[PDB]
Amino acid sequence: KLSEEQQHIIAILLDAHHKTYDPTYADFRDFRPPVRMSPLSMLPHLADLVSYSIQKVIGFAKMIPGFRDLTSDDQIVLLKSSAIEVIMLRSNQSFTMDDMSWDCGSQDYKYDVTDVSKAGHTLELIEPLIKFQVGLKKLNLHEEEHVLLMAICIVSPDRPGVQDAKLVEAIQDRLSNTLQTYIRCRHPPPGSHQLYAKMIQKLADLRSLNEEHSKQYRSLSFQPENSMKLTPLVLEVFGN
């Protein structure tokens, strides 16, 4: 029951994700090395991982049908506000409930709670993120649903600063309708039960995660010694 246009949207998003998410994580070797033993030994590595991820999220976003047709200012507002949320979403692909960590192919690139703690985060702030990853992983999303979810997250018409909210909403509605139809037509029960609602709830959960983790970014980067360990792109997109 998926229209020709809806199948096209999905085809475009899958291609976009595949070209911006390398499941082998080969590029991680180019990041400053992780250090597990300034007590924030993992800050350099995770700053590089996040900076790299921001580049990839932008690469994915530019491929969302209609996104590049919004004004440059709105594209910027949408990406600055969704970047950390999309990184959290895309990271679910490497996340494993086996031991509650992000497994990127090797021990050196396997990140757990302690590693994030070594980048400045309090254990209290890390817990909700782990819980979020577990809940998202349990939805067993089809890759089609996963890429649609990331796209919907990016083109959210309510982000403060958006000028042409109606245009952003037009794109999101097309993506939302595509997702709803895909679930009803291609996701078998019981996994499909209230799936759209559960997925959109994850986007609401992400607003809270964004708020708390952004506060942490501001506190950490407020100290010159820590900002010095970040990257130009992180400072530009997240703030400086």
């Binding site: 580049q55 932008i58 690469g59 976003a61 530019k62 590049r68 440059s72 594209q75 910027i76 990406l79 600055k80 130009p232 792109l233 530009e236 997109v237």
Partner: peptide, 11 residues
């Protein structure tokens, strides 16, 4: 504040 790098990655 301008976002030169972000803008270039969008091109």
């Amino acid at each position: 504040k301008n976002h030169p790098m972000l803008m270039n990655l969008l091109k």
